[PDB]
Amino acid sequence: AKFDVYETLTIPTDVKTIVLTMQHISTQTQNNMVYYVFLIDGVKILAEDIKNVNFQIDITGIWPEYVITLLLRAINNGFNTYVSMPNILYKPTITADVRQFMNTTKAETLLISNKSIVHEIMFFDNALQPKMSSDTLALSEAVYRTIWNSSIITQRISARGLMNLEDARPPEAKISHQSELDMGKIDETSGE
Amino acid sequence: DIKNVNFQIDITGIWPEYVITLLLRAINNGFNTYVSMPNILYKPTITADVRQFMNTTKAETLLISNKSIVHEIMFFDNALQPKMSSDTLALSEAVY
Amino acid sequence: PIYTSGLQKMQSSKVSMANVVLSAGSDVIRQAAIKYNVVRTQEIILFE
Amino acid sequence: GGSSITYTSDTTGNPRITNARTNNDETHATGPIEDLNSTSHGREPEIESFADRAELAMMIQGMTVGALTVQPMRSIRSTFANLANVLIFHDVFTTEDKPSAFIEYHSDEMIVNMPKQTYNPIDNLAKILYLPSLEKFKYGTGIVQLNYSPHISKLYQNTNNIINTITDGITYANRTEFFIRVMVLMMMDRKILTMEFYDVDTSAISNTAILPTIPTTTGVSPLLRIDTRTEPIWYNDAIKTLITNLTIQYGKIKTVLDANAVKRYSVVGYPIDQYRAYLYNHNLLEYLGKKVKREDIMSLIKALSYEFDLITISDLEYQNIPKWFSDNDLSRFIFSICMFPDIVRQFHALNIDYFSQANVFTVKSENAIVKMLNSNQNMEPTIINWFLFRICAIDKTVIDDYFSLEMTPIIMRPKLYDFDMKRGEPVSLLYILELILFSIMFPNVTQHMLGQIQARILYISMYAFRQEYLKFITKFGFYYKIVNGRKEYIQVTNQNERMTENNDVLTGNLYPSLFTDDPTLSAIAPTLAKIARLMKPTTSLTPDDRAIAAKFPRFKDSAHLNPYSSLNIGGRTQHSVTYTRMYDAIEEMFNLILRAFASSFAQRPRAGVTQLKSLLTQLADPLCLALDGHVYHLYNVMANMMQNFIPNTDGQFHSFRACSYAVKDGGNIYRVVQNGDELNESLLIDTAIVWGLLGNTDSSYGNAIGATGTANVPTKVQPVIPTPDNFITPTIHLKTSIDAICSVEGILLLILSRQTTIPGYEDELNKLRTGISQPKVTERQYRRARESIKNMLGSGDYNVAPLHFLLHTEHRSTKLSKPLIRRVLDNVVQPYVANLDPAEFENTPQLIENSNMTRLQIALKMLTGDMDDIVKGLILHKRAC
Amino acid sequence: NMPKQTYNPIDNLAKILYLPSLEKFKYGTGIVQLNYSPHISKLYQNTNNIINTITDGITYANRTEFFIRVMVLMMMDRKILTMEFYDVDTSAISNT
């Protein structure tokens, strides 16, 4: 919960970082059926026993169709996984108004593209989340999120929040930078 | 974050709405999770009838019962699976 | 209300006019509401 | 006079409560957020999630490409709803906008034609701000003077209405009356002030006295006159040089949001009579600071419920809601019950409501006990005609009264109604058995009827046992008296009147025989040890913490006698001990009656006796089943209710010594249990109810499992016991009723009987009391006073503790000067002693809540100040000065 | 649902001067953010019109096109600004 924006997700250190190449995708059998598995350390691993791996995928365009389903199941049906891709181009739209945080794009099409298809993504924000009503019994609902920004995404944000929690600066609000309030003199030659 | 536990429900029925939801959320996404209930009466019927094998009860109901009613459950066997022709592409997604 | 530094405006038995008043705002009368969930463990009769 | 007490008001602290079985929306929490820590707003929406469906159902398949969208998703969240309900808490007081002060300036001038006014402002700011004041302290006034506002000059009567004295004109009496009524006004009527502001910038120049934010509705003051140029420049100079040291302002000073409950208020500097200001401030700043520890709510809502339940509540800590607690709860309760005995009738009524709500017993017709024993005519023909004259009809509205009479605090010793007994024949043993059953079924009520039962059973024995009887009398004659730890037996060495029942046997150092062991009792007169041992309850003693954790009132280390056991111990459904008890009781008694037949009358037949022995056992089985299987839980709940706080027994019929606190009121003494010959038909109880019950009962338990249904079985629906709803509201209704009547009595004590009230002043109270004309007040004056006030606090009627009898009632006197609570051992008021009394009383109980005490303090220190329109002495003279 | 606005000015000066801004950065905002005005969001096409390439969705091409057209807009269209003033005295106090 509490989706920060200024924060970029950092990969924890105790995760093997496996580059994805077309060699780790092999087959095995059990009970006379031919399933698809991984070859991460020589041992054939089913797509759900993945414990701690971080898949570095780069070209994002050529992966036939199998590894798509495998990657998706392992992001599901998995314990602690990460699929980074530091070459996807996307236009971010950042907003904080729950009534219009509509954003519909199945991660399939995000993954099967042509390496330059730059497309749109939305981004919620609730760091200044006001306390819930004095009735709610107990928030027993999961709100698992998904794709995380991997770089600084807030250059066009001028001010966040504008509330006050107990008549004091909330610990995580942002006033403007002194850059975009200065007003120097003119240069009498050609403005500028 | 549950890693390796087996919750052993003593008796079913008396669990309001917290723990049924937390247990359901736990058996998914847990690593070595088990919920062993060695007191609920069921009655098995075993078939190998992929055409006519039902899916009578989802587990969300085996945790809501007055501990004294015997459910009936249809087990499906397939141990004698033929090894299909060496032409078909191996599958990509299993069954749970 | 106390004086400026005097004892208290309820000891001198002398009336004053310009003391200070609290005020609330538009809506300070929101009635309150709670809710409970009930589920019972052992019924009264039981056992096949 | 009247017999029902229906009195209420809206001056107490207790809240108002309503319910709703609503779970499809909220529509109950509404408001604007004022801070990121605000806890009382409406509801905002949430992230728009998606399906994320994956059941767990024995070989479900993949469905992989659809899920895992870029929008966040949810968890599983199974669906049962687990009995959800909503409580809604309302407080009492409201708002208003204009100040509406108490004291106000009013002026008058001395010149009939005065210089014209010279003030033409331009900007409408000067107008709105200080035109009115500049009008009040106009040029050429002659005196500006303090005075009461309207509504106070209205409260002045002026004639007499409350003190019935034949007077000559107006003298101190209208003053006293006026004080009382303005006092009772201010004690009531909470209000909190809401104003509206402007947007003044710096237009109000050079006057530090004016902040940049003004209330719309102006006021009058010299501070607003100073700035302009008017009547003597001298005057402004003087005011300014006078006030240049003080700290005066106007308009909003600052704003702070309270932490006990986050809601912005605002301290403002308006001019107003200090007393109204203090009233506003106090009664607001009280509204925001009422905490209720969360688990107390839980203990409450669980105390009024079946004990085997998981109860969950909204889960923030320290909700702000008017608490029903007190420091002096039991004090006012016993002070009330000891001087308003109809309140026990209210208790009892609510209790039968709760009980009959669960319809434990419905009644069928044609009692079997008389169907059989009628059409076989092969037994002794007195069993007839006797069982035939005892079985009265039954309509549950008596069943559900006798059963409820089990728990409510008994206050008048009860006597049994009917008593039939043949002198010589051995049939009376049936009556013995009847009351044995009635004792084994309600061990509580017996605890008091012990006195009558003594003489009755002894009489019957005397005509059916002689050696045992007279031998017993010789040794253990009639009464215990505990001298110093030993037990001396006093006798009655005369058959003058042995069968009396009026000897206050349960209060005072005088115990009945037959009961406390002295193991030599047995092996002296058997069948009498055999009787006594059969009647002692010997069930249990349970604490009742469940209540004591809900801040309900009762003494420390309180207990009860749940007369029955349970059935479910680990899930076994055991043998319902009460049945074994009752069964061996019946069997032993019939063995005894049979041996009785075999003594005097052998020429008679003895088959019917064993016949109906079998009948009685077979008929008592399912009854006791329903008793220990359904009622037990009901008695636990009722034992944790709020009405019942006087336990009725310690169990053992040895030295019980029923409760003995009592209120002494200067010579007169009112007791709680009211020994002596006194009762009312609401409490004269019958015994045959057990016969009728055991015969023609249809228990909702039996036909539930199909054990006593008609033409069908079962119904398989579980016996219902009431819901924690439907009782919060009546219970709080009851508590607020008694708090209101005690508040009335306290206000009355305040201004009568001088030597009781001395909070912190003792001087203006003395000033007030001048007007009662005597340091002792006649009754009728007192009565009329209380009626006039009670018709001005709330609504309804109530009485002044009359005492009943079988036919007539009497209205004891009511004075109450300096009431005190003390315990009375052996009808002699003891002095107070620490560590035995609850150490709480120690002094007169403070009958008035703290807040109202403050408000009365304010009323006093206001209208005993400089607004006392009274002065003494003057001098006639004739001079042309 | 937010706390109500508390600003009743009297003089119409405060109104004309800073009612709108005081409306924008209102109490209880959550983010105030930069953005292109109209006519620029209008200049975004979004489809292709200047670079005849067979493409798959949107990729760098609409960006290039958009740059070209806003550029050629600003290269053209000279304008010089003419405004109109008031007569405020000292009512705007304490604010240098």
Number of Cβ within 10 Å of residue E53's Cβ equals 7
End-to-end CA distance of chain D: 67
> Which residues lie across from D430 on neighbouring strands?
none
> Looking only at Cα atoms, what is the longest distance across chain E?
64
Resolution, rounded to a tenth of an Å?
3.9
Element (H, E) at B47: strand B42-47
Q: Which of D431, D336, D346 shows the shortest CA–CA distance to D682?
A: D346
What phi, psi does D223 have (nearest 5°)? -55, -30
Number of Cβ within 10 Å of residue D821's Cβ equals 23
Smallest CA–CA separation between A37 and chain B, in Å? Answer: 9
Is the CA virtual torsion C4, C7, C9, C14 positive or negative?
negative
8 Å CB contact between D817 and D756: yes
Which residues does chain B have within 8 Å of residue D307's beta carbon, measured at their own beta carbons? Answer: none
Q: CB-based contact (8 Å) between A35 and chain B?
A: yes
CB pairs under 8 A between A and E: 48
Between CA D523 and CA D592 the distance in angstroms is 17
Q: Residue C32: left (phi > 0), alpha (psi -120 to 50), or beta? A: beta
User: Tokens 């995708």 appear where?
Assistant: A25
Which residues does chain A have within 8 Å of residue C37's beta carbon, measured at their own beta carbons? Answer: 137
Smallest CA–CA separation between D566 and chain E, in Å? Answer: 54
Query: For residues D217, D218, D220 and D222, what is the CA-based torsion angle, rounded to 10 degrees?
Result: 160
> Residue E2 is which amino acid?
M
- Taking an 8 Å cut-off on Cβ atoms, the answer to whether D58 and B20 are in contact is no
Number of Cβ within 10 Å of residue D621's Cβ equals 14
Q: Which of D596, D476, D581, D583 shows the shortest CA–CA distance to D533?
A: D581
SS (H, E, C) D563-592: CCCCCCCCCCCCCCHHHHHHHHHHHHHHHH
Pairing of strands D820-825, D16-20: unpaired
> HSE of D768 in the Cβ direction (CA atoms, 13 Å)?
28
Number of Cβ within 10 Å of residue A192's Cβ equals 6
SS3 D33: coil
Per DSSP, A11 falls in state P
Could you list the beta-strand ranges (E) of D131-255.
Answer: 141-148, 191-193, 252-254
Q: How far is CA D219 from CA D13, D136, D147, D225, in A?
A: 34, 10, 16, 11
Alpha helices in A79-166 (DSSP H): 107-111
Q: Is the peptide bond before E46 cis (omega within 30 degrees of 0)?
A: yes
Query: For residues D133, D139, D140 and D143, what is the CA-based torsion angle, rounded to 10 degrees?
Result: 20
8 Å CB contact between D204 and D129: yes
Between CA E22 and CA E14 the distance in angstroms is 10
Output b/e per residue, D642-661; b: 16+ Cβ within 10 A: bbbbbbbbbbebeebebbbb
SS3 D186: helix
User: Tokens 């003030």 appear where?
Assistant: D119
Residues on A contacting E at a C-beta cutoff of 8 Å: 89, 94-97, 113-114, 116-119, 125, 128, 156-163
Q: Which of residues 11-70 of B touch C (CB under 8 A)?
A: 13-17, 66, 68
- Taking an 8 Å cut-off on Cβ atoms, the answer to whether B90 and A27 are in contact is yes
Smallest CA–CA separation between D85 and chain C, in Å? Answer: 6
The answer for residues whose C-beta is within 8 angstroms of residue D125's C-beta and 6 or more apart is D200, D203, D204, E10, E11
8 Å CB contact between D535 and D446: yes
8 Å CB contact between D567 and D574: yes
Number of Cβ within 10 Å of residue D487's Cβ equals 14
Between CA D41 and CA A133 the distance in angstroms is 6
Q: Which of D743, D740, D553, D707 shows the shortest CA–CA distance to D644?
A: D553
Cα B95–chain centre separation: 12
Instruction: List the structure tokens of D208.
Output: 């530090």
Between CA D328 and CA D746 the distance in angstroms is 14
- Taking an 8 Å cut-off on Cβ atoms, the answer to whether A157 and E60 are in contact is no
Q: Is the peptide bond before D714 cis (omega within 30 degrees of 0)?
A: yes
Give me the residue from B16, B66, B68 closest to C39, CB to CB: B16
| Rg, Å, chain A Cα set | 23
Q: Rounded to the nearest 5 degrees, what angle is found at the Cα of E22, between the Cα atoms of E16 and E24? A: 115
Alpha helices in D324-466 (DSSP H): 330-337, 342-356, 368-371, 383-390, 399-402, 429-441, 443-462
Residue of D nearest to C8 (CA): D274
Give me the residue from B14, B17, B68 closest to C41, CB to CB: B14
Instruction: List the structure tokens of B1.
Output: 């974050």
Number of Cβ within 10 Å of residue B32's Cβ equals 10
Between CA D369 and CA D692 the distance in angstroms is 8
Q: Which of D636, D642, D844 shows the shortest CA–CA distance to D737?
A: D642
> HSE of D102 in the Cβ direction (CA atoms, 13 Å)?
21
Give me the residue from E1, E9, E94 closest to D199, CB to CB: E9
Could you list the beta-strand ranges (E) of D255-320.
Answer: 266-268, 291-292, 309-313, 319-320
Between CA D496 and CA D478 the distance in angstroms is 14
Could you list the beta-strand ranges (E) of chain E.
Answer: 31-33
User: Tokens 């002096």 appear where?
Assistant: D328
Number of Cβ within 10 Å of residue D603's Cβ equals 5
8 Å CB contact between D747 and D786: no
Between CA D668 and CA D816 the distance in angstroms is 9
The answer for residues whose C-beta is within 8 angstroms of residue A38's C-beta and 6 or more apart is A24, A25, A26, A44, A45, A46, A47, A50, A70
Between CA C27 and CA E4 the distance in angstroms is 10
What phi, psi does A158 have (nearest 5°)? -95, -40
SS3 content of chain E, % helix, strand, coil (to 5): 30, 5, 65
Between CA D568 and CA D560 the distance in angstroms is 21
Between CA D9 and CA D4 the distance in angstroms is 17
List the helix and strand counts (H, then E) for chain E.
Answer: 4, 1
Per DSSP, D47 falls in state -
8 Å CB contact between A22 and A61: no
Q: Is the peptide bond before D502 cis (omega within 30 degrees of 0)?
A: no
Q: In what order do the strands lie in the sheet with A25-29?
A: A25-29, A34-39, A44-45
Query: For residues D38, D43, D44 and D48, what is the CA-based torsion angle, rounded to 10 degrees?
Result: 140
Chains near D (3 or more Cβ pairs under 8 Å): A, B, C, E
SS3 D490: strand
| Rg, Å, chain B Cα set | 17
The answer for residues whose C-beta is within 8 angstroms of residue A43's C-beta and 6 or more apart is none
Total residue length of chain B: 96
Instruction: Report the residue numbers after which chain D has a gap, meaning the C atom sits over 2.5 angstroms from the next written residue's N, or none.
Output: none
The answer for residues whose C-beta is within 8 angstroms of residue D382's C-beta and 6 or more apart is D422, D425, D427
User: Tokens 């009503």 appear where?
Assistant: A133
Residue of D nearest to E19 (CA): D199
Of D27, D41, D70, D82, which to mutate for an interface test with A (greatest number of A Cβ within 10 Å)? D70
Q: How far is CA D234 from CA D105, D132, D207, D246, D572, in A?
A: 22, 21, 18, 20, 99
Number of Cβ within 10 Å of residue A47's Cβ equals 25
> Residue D677 is which amino acid?
D
Number of Cβ within 10 Å of residue E87's Cβ equals 4
Q: Which of A49, A54, A107, A47 shows the shortest CA–CA distance to A83?
A: A54
Between CA B80 and CA B82 the distance in angstroms is 6
Residue of D nearest to C45 (CA): D718
Q: Which of A66, A25, A20, A71 shows the shortest CA–CA distance to A48?
A: A71
Give me the residue from C13, C20, C35 closest to D314, CB to CB: C35
Instruction: List the structure tokens of D171.
Output: 């003298």
What angle do helix axes D443-462 and D467-475 make, rounded to 10 degrees? 110
